[PDB]
């Protein structure tokens, strides 16, 4: 399958874990993968990670040739800055059909912990095999997007304060959301039956 990739930076706190559960390794059935994200943890609250994501590398160290326990030792001994290179299954492209119509709605949200409480996946890419609309794949319960109640997994992010996301990469779309201010109006596209 064609994969999307993304870089996630997590700041580790002196007396705590990341709330990130990792499965896999050369001695295991699967490759290194996010298998759980602890509720309210650093990893969950980043809004950049999802269960099922593959971890290709931590701090520029490729994980694939490590045994499971070696990957864990690596993660437990990282300093405050953890840099995960992540690969993920691309979001399916929703297409307008006879029974599916697209509509839009403006959603205003305020930040909390510098995030809007949703994960985006996809984005423009030179390799058209990897190129996708920017899809909101997860909405963290209790977070801003969840509280406001409009945005749903599968919805597309079209613009952020009138800045349109067409042609923008995943990294670019993330920066637009980061360099956003504490409030933002987002344009959301979604599926309607018939």
């Amino acid at each position: 399958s064609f994969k999307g990739s993304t870089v996630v930076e997590l700041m580790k706190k002196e007396g705590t874990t990341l709330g990130l559960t990792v499965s896999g390794g050369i001695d295991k059935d699967g490759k290194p993968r996010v298998s759980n994200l602890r509720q309210g943890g650093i990893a969950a609250r980043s809004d950049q990670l999802d269960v099922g994501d593959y971890i290709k590398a931590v701090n520029g160290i490729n994980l694939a040739k490590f045994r499971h326990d070696e990957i864990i030792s690596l993660l437990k001994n990282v300093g405050e800055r953890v840099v995960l290179e992540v690969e993920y299954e691309l979001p399916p492209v929703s297409i307008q059909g006879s029974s599916v119509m697209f509509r839009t709605v403006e959603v205003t949200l305020h930040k909390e912990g510098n995030t809007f409480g949703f994960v985006i996946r996809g984005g423009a890419h030179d390799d058209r095999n990897k190129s996708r609309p920017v899809v909101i794949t997860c909405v963290r319960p209790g977070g801003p997007a969840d509280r406001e109640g409009t945005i749903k997994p599968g919805d597309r992010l079209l613009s952020v304060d009138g800045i349109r996301l067409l042609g923008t990469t995943h990294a670019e779309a993330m920066s637009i959301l980061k360099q956003c201010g504490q409030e933002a109006t987002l344009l959301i596209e979604y599926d309607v039956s018939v």
């Binding site: 874990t17 990341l18 709330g19 990130l20 559960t21 990792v22 499965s23 896999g24 993968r33 298998s35 759980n36 602890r38 499971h68 326990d69 864990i72 993660l75 437990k76």
Partner: peptide, 4 residues
Amino acid sequence: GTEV
């Protein structure tokens, strides 16, 4: 898997 193992939690970190």
